[PDB]
Design a protein around this ligand. Structure first.
Ligand SMILES: [Cu+2]
Ligand SMILES: [Cu+2]
Lengths: 321, 313
């Protein structure tokens, strides 16, 4: 152990993530290790490990040098299996090993995501401070311009820092939304208290519900404030039966993936194949809005669970998010 | 569509009809028998918001024509001897909200042997403060020449704060003054008051006041020759309202050649057949496309200096 060790290892793992590791130790590990030959390092007698492997083997896991969204029900599951290994390691010998072994044949997004969540929640990651996403995978936090300016630097082997950019809109209250600090927090908040947490993982995040209610209420408040300061008017509430008034162009790019799709202004909400129907929301919204109005949330049995009490708002945040 | 119309049977009457057209929008088939509307009357149209919506439209109908002309050359704008040296305001330029009182008597019916009660209405109108012009400029000609002092007040930034271009802003400029003065042969500083402006008219005498006066003259022996035509806008309206913080407008002083202007002849309120005295078209010389500012900028007799207006709360 140590930390200036654990730490070191981490830094190495997340170094030039888009390419096979250059740190020799990480690679003989990456090669010689077998997550299945001492089912003892694992507190599960390695059921986790044996499940990743099985996938890695039938090679039914997402490819490397490809994008990844945490909203993709499969990409998530895969990402989250790495979490589950890293998670039941008794000591560092087992983490390093895996987050090396996998690091090299699992996709980067799943991987970056997996490592962070794992470091954050696993028993074994106390000493560590995680590098800032913004510098680990800069395509998600940097402009598309600066990105290309950086690819040029590199082509020519000439160094230096480029100035990023952001009178026509409400990309006047932009400084708020595009800040690398908020973006960090926004992701961290949901890494700290993930929507996918099962108390099987080890403990129980306390009031994730009210936490959820509140955190957004404040982005939402903080946001409303800035627009105040900009002669702008408080934000419109979004409806599924209306047009999406204010659309934008992000001018942002994926590393592997392409450029973030843009949305024109005054658009009509389309039924999106694979996710869900527009109407599917409308009804959800109704079911929600009826719990609130009745006084109770009704479970699967037709058991009405009361929410006209203090535990109220979290039970509500459990069903809303 | 006045009667000067060449083919009124074909081009009809856009502007007028547009008035009546916008007015019954409250009752087109007239099922309600509502009276005419705010827009179907001159002393009340400026009231309704579409008023300005309707004239922006008319405005760019004209602009389409106004803009078809080739920009102006150099040889075009220049007044050969005469060059303005400086433009300064021995002022402030500060606007606030005064208070006015007109009388509500003709409004209430008073029959007979029931006597008059003096009722009044008090309104809140805008106002500014006197400030004079100080135009400094030489006659590098051999004698004396007549000159037209043309002064526009254009905007500078966008309200996005983009700062438009005397193309983007040339059309946006409001006329502040226009006067003909004789220039002497060399260094001279001409001055001009808020109060001498040609596009302005003072508030008018009260009715009673005009009564007292019509009367006071008939009981023992009347000169309001000041107010027999009056085409202009309220002096109080001279300058725009602004921000309390203040803003910078762009002041345009363009001095054209009086002898070719008035190359032929009140004459401000030509109410009786009186030939408009200036010959330049209207809005000269900002009425034409100004593609490269590069030009306005190199005629001696045109000069622009930024002013600043503040609003006292
Ligand atoms: Cu969130
Ligand atoms: Cu009109």
């Amino acid at each position: 152990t140590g930390n200036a060790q654990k730490q070191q290892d981490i830094n190495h793992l997340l170094d030039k993530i888009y390419e096979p590791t250059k740190y020799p130790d990480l690679k003989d590990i990456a090669e010689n290790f077998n997550p299945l030959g001492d089912t003892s390092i694992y507190n599960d007698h390695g059921a986790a490990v044996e499940t990743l492997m099985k996938e890695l083997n039938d090679h039914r896991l997402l490819e490397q040098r490809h994008w990844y969204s945490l909203f993709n029900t499969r990409q998530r599951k895969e990402a989250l299996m790495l979490f589950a290994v890293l998670n039941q390691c008794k000591e560092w010998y087992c983490f390093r090993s895996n987050a090396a072994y996998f690091r090299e044949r699992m996709n980067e997004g799943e991987f970056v995501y997996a490592l962070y969540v794992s470091v954050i929640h696993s028993k074994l990651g106390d000493g560590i401070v995680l590098p800032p996403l913004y510098q680990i995978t800069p395509h998600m936090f940097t402009n598309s311009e600066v990105i290309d300016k950086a690819y040029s630097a590199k082509m020519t082997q000439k160094p230096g820092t480029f100035n990023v950019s952001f009178k026509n809109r409400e990309q006047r209250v932009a400084y708020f939304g595009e800040d690398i600090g908020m973006n960090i927090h926004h992701v961290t908040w949901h890494m700290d208290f993930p929507f996918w947490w099962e108390d099987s993982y080890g403990y129980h995040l306390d009031r994730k519900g009210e936490l959820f209610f509140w955190v957004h209420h404040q982005l939402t408040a903080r946001f409303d404030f800035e627009r105040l300061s900009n002669w702008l008017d408080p934000v419109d509430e979004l409806h599924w039966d209306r047009i999406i008034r204010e659309g934008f162009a992000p001018l942002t790019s994926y590393k592997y993936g392409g450029e973030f799709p843009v949305r024109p202004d005054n658009i009509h909400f389309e039924d999106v194949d694979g996710v869900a129907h527009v109407h599917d929301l409308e009804i959800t919204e109704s079911r929600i809005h009826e719990a609130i109005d009745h006084g109770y949330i009704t479970d699967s049995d037709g058991h009405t669970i009361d929410i006209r009490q203090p535990k109220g708002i979290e039970l509500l945040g459990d069903i809303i998010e | 569509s006045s009667k000067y119309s060449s083919n009124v049977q074909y081009y009809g009457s856009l502007h007028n009809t547009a008035h009546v057209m916008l007015g019954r929008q409250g009752d087109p088939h007239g099922k309600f028998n509502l009276p005419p509307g705010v827009m179907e009357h001159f002393e009340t149209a400026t009231r309704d918001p579409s008023f300005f919506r309707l004239h922006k439209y008319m405005d760019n109908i004209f602009k389409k024509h106004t803009d078809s002309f080739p920009p102006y050359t150099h040889d075009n704008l220049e007044f050969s001897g005469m060059v303005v040296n400086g433009v300064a305001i021995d002022g402030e330029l500060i606007t606030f909200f005064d208070e006015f009182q007109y009388s509500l008597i003709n409004a209430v019916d008073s029959g007979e042997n029931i006597e008059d009660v003096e009722i009044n209405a008090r309104v809140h109108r805008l106002n500014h403060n006197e400030f004079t012009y100080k135009i400094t400029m030489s006659n590098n000609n051999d004698g004396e020449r007549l000159a037209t002092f043309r002064i526009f007040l254009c905007p500078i930034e966008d309200n996005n704060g983009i700062t438009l271009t005397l193309d983007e802003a040339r059309w946006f400029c409001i006329e502040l003054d226009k006067f003909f003065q004789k220039v002497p042969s060399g260094p001279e500083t001409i001055e001009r008051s808020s109060k001498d402006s040609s596009v302005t008219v003072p508030d008018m005498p009260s009715f009673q006041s005009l009564k007292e006066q019509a009367d006071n003259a008939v009981n023992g022996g009347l000169d309001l020759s000041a107010y027999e035509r009056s085409c202009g806008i309220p002096d109080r309206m001279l300058l725009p309202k602004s921000k309390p913080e203040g803003m910078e407008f762009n002041l345009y002083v363009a001095v054209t050649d009086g002898d070719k202007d008035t190359e032929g002849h009140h004459a401000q309120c030509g109410v009786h057949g009186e030939a408009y005295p200036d010959n330049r078209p209207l809005g000269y010389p900002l009425e034409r496309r100004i593609p490269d500012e590069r030009v306005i900028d190199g005629v001696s007799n045109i000069k622009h200096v930024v002013v600043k207006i503040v609003h006292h709360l």
